[PDB]
Amino acid sequence: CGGMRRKNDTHQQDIDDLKRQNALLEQQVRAL
Amino acid sequence: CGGVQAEEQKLISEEDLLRKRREQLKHKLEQL
Query: DSSP readout, A1-32?
Result: ---HHHHHHHHHHHHHHHHHHHHHHHHHHTT-
List C-alpha distances in Å: A16 to A23, A30, B20. Answer: 10, 21, 15
Nearest to B20, CA basis, from A25, A12, A10: A25
* Cβ atoms of residues B23 and A24 within 8 Å: no
CA–CA separation, A17 and B6 (whole Å):
22
Report yes or no: B20 at the A interface, CB cutoff 8 Å: no
Sort out which chain A residues have CB atoms less than 8 A from B12's CB and list them. 11
Report yes or no: B27 at the A interface, CB cutoff 8 Å: no
Q: How was this structure determined?
A: NMR
* Cβ atoms of residues B17 and A15 within 8 Å: no
Rounded to the nearest angstrom, the gap between the alpha carbon of residue B7 and the centroid of all alpha carbons in its chain is 15
Q: Which residue of A has its CA nearest to B13?
A: A11
